[PDB]
Design a protein around this motif. Structure first.
Motif, PDB file in Angstrom:
ATOM      1  N   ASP A 265       0.853  -1.187   0.000  1.00  0.00           N
ATOM      2  CA  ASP A 265       0.000   0.000   0.000  1.00  0.00           C
ATOM      3  C   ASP A 265       0.889   1.238   0.000  1.00  0.00           C
ATOM      4  OD1 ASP A 265      -2.034   1.899   0.149  1.00  0.00           O
ATOM      5  OD2 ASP A 265      -2.681   1.399   2.187  1.00  0.00           O
ATOM      6  N   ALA A 266       0.837   2.014  -1.077  1.00  0.00           N
ATOM      7  CA  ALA A 266       1.677   3.204  -1.168  1.00  0.00           C
ATOM      8  C   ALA A 266       0.899   4.480  -0.883  1.00  0.00           C
ATOM      9  CB  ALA A 266       2.337   3.287  -2.534  1.00  0.00           C
ATOM     10  N   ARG A 267      -0.276   4.343  -0.280  1.00  0.00           N
ATOM     11  CA  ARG A 267      -1.090   5.515   0.054  1.00  0.00           C
ATOM     12  C   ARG A 267      -0.422   6.421   1.091  1.00  0.00           C
ATOM     13  NH1 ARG A 267      -2.356   9.543   1.725  1.00  0.00           N
ATOM     14  NH2 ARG A 267      -4.420  10.349   2.334  1.00  0.00           N
ATOM     15  N   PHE A 268       0.041   5.836   2.189  1.00  0.00           N
ATOM     16  CA  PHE A 268       0.597   6.633   3.279  1.00  0.00           C
ATOM     17  C   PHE A 268       2.125   6.767   3.238  1.00  0.00           C
ATOM     18  CE2 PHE A 268      -3.479   4.962   4.836  1.00  0.00           C
ATOM     19  CZ  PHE A 268      -4.105   6.171   5.096  1.00  0.00           C
ATOM     20  N   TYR A 269       2.787   5.706   2.792  1.00  0.00           N
ATOM     21  CA  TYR A 269       4.236   5.643   2.619  1.00  0.00           C
ATOM     22  C   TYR A 269       4.496   5.084   1.229  1.00  0.00           C
ATOM     23  CZ  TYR A 269       3.726   5.769   7.674  1.00  0.00           C
ATOM     24  OH  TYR A 269       3.327   6.078   8.948  1.00  0.00           O
ATOM     25  N   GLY A 270       5.282   5.780   0.411  1.00  0.00           N
ATOM     26  CA  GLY A 270       5.592   5.252  -0.909  1.00  0.00           C
ATOM     27  C   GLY A 270       6.695   6.028  -1.598  1.00  0.00           C
ATOM     28  N   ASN A 271       7.185   5.510  -2.722  1.00  0.00           N
ATOM     29  CA  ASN A 271       8.203   6.221  -3.489  1.00  0.00           C
ATOM     30  C   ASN A 271       7.545   6.766  -4.740  1.00  0.00           C
ATOM     31  OD1 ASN A 271       7.915   3.996  -5.179  1.00  0.00           O
ATOM     32  ND2 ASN A 271      10.120   3.602  -5.375  1.00  0.00           N
ATOM     33  N   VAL A 272       8.360   7.116  -5.727  1.00  0.00           N
ATOM     34  CA  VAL A 272       7.877   7.762  -6.939  1.00  0.00           C
ATOM     35  C   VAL A 272       6.842   6.884  -7.678  1.00  0.00           C
ATOM     36  CG1 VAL A 272       9.781   6.813  -8.265  1.00  0.00           C
ATOM     37  CG2 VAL A 272       8.618   8.886  -9.106  1.00  0.00           C
TER      38      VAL A 272
END
Ligand code: 7L6
Ligand code: 7L6
Ligand code: SAM
Ligand code: SAM
Ligand code: ZN
Ligand code: ZN
Ligand code: ZN
Ligand code: ZN
Ligand code: ZN
Ligand code: ZN
Ligand code: ZN
Ligand code: ZN
Lengths: 259, 257
Positions: free
Chosen positions: B179-186
């Motif tokens: 899940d890249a909603r709260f923590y993610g890269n490009v």
């Protein structure tokens, strides 16, 4: 004559090679262990890696101000612009150092990041005359410089208690106690010999996690280390309370405490 | 006119900066998430990190021979000397890739190490006309090149099931999700395309816990300077989101319009 028996015992995993030389005997490059540049586990260690459990800073600068929350945790940030420990740093009683991490608002190049940037000193594994392998610096190292981390296998105290080979153990004290065992897996630090007036001091450091049961052990120089000099740290009283029954210290200090 | 609204959304954590520009409207640089360059967790994921569980190679060369165990786990090493996938790599149905690791006898510069060296391409976050923020390449990217990793928060399927916002979810087929909603890269900003210039490949590096592949995007073709990146979000995404909106990828072969 001085034989080069490895151009890099780290096989390219460090920022610099760590060659091995032998000018004493016919012993080949040590191979009864696996070199690892970062800590590992066999049995699971439930290290707390919940990102929301990290304390972090909200700095808008390079974390060199009085207000850095990570510095505050460390009492103050002890690093100068060159990444060296301040002259005020207490070598006899070091504080816990909390470096900035990936939850902080600052940039990756902020001031409060030194150990997480890895080994930089030019080091060399060499055959000593009287205490097997040792590690020397190939360069001048100013006081308060990060030299290397004590890296190995993270194990519980109860596991350490049933390991016959305890000559490569570093205690992480706390009532839940863990050790780093560098016997089977370790980096260059496993070869550093004991000295009663040591030019290195171990400092407990936190970077990507802040699980207080698992500080990482960073050796900093306690003084100017001159090129060619053997590295040493104080193995401590538990080591010598055990091994003193078997042999005495050969560090050769005029103030040796375990001879 | 093209406003620079961030010189680097990664704040120095990638090899090069990833600027953010906006030549479309007045939207500031996205700030409702935390950029992380590597995967994280909140709730513990009991990833198997027992070093003795790693399979590894005993190669004395640069792992370019068919005797390399890590190559055999991958069916073969798919990397040429430049770190690019060989022409015979199956883009339509990618194998698992096992890169060499810290248990292998080989050196840190061996042939079978690409994704573990991280993002290299010059990318840019930018404001599209039609589908919010997107990611473009600032330079030519040859076919078979590693572009970026899909990075975010590793979570269980049951945790995914109770999260409102599912627009930044990547399924790792009990199953897990990034899940890249709260923590993610490009990668969280890459839009869907039905004829995509990126393909996700499952890769294993420091651990070989098959529940948790890491997701590496490789170019499926030459990507020209200035081109928007896209990958195929897949059928589960569109089964859900197709009730709310239609695909605007604009392909003559669009399957979700
Ligand atoms: C810092 O140097 C040493 C630390 C050691 N630490 C432990 N434990 C951690 C505390 O909790 C019990 C374990 N055990 C050792 N030895 C044990 C003693 C018991 N023996 C049956 C197995 C080896 C050590 C030995 C050391 O050097 C000789
Ligand atoms: C690849 O794109 C998606 C993957 C999704 N995966 C799951 N899982 C549920 C647990 O098993 C499988 C992984 N759920 C989604 N959506 C929701 C989660 C919130 N729930 C209330 C309804 C289902 C997804 C949505 C996606 O895009 C819209
Ligand atoms: C962690 S090892 C150091 C590397 C070791 N010299 C080698 O060749 O593998 C610890 C062992 O080195 C030897 N050693 C280290 N410091 C010593 C000292 N000051 N006096 C005598 N022996 C020492 C002892 O055998 C000790 O158990
Ligand atoms: C992971 S995000 C991509 C980044 C997004 N554009 C943003 O501004 O944050 C996924 C969302 O972008 C939009 N999007 C991505 N690809 C699209 C497409 N091909 N057609 C229409 N909307 C798309 C949809 O709203 C989708 O839910
Ligand atoms: Zn700060
Ligand atoms: Zn900082
Ligand atoms: Zn900080
Ligand atoms: Zn002594
Ligand atoms: Zn190999
Ligand atoms: Zn290998
Ligand atoms: Zn290899
Ligand atoms: Zn489409």
């Amino acid at each position: 004559v001085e034989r080069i028996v490895s151009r890099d015992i780290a096989r390219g995993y460090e920022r610099i090679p760590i060659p091995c030389v032998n000018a004493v005997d016919s012993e080949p490059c040590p191979s009864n262990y696996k070199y690892v540049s970062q800590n590992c586990v066999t049995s699971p260690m439930n290290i707390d890696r919940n990102i929301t459990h990290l304390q972090y800073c909200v700095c808008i600068d390079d974390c060199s101000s009085s207000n850095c929350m990570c510095g505050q945790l460390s009492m103050r940030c002890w690093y100068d612009k060159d990444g060296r420990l301040l002259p005020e740093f207490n070598m006899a009683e070091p504080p816990l150092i909390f470096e900035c991490n990936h939850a902080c608002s600052c940039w990756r190049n902020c001031r409060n990041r030194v150990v997480q940037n890895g080994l930089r000193a030019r080091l060399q594994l060499y055959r000593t005359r009287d205490m097997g392998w040792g590690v020397r610096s190939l360069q001048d190292i100013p006081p308060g410089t990060f030299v290397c981390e004590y890296v190995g296998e993270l194990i519980s105290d109860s596991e350490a208690d049933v390991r016959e080979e305890d000559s490569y153990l570093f205690d992480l004290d706390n009532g839940e106690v863990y050790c780093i065992d560098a016997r089977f897996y370790g980096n260059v630090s496993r070869f550093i010999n004991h000295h009663c007036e040591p030019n290195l001091v171990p400092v407990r450091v936190f970077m990507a996690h802040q699980d207080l049961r698992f500080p990482r052990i960073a050796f900093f120089s306690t003084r100017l280390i001159e090129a060619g000099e053997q590295l040493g740290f104080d193995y401590g009283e538990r080591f010598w309370d055990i091994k003193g029954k078997l042999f005495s210290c050969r560090c050769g200090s005029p103030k040796c405490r375990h001879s």
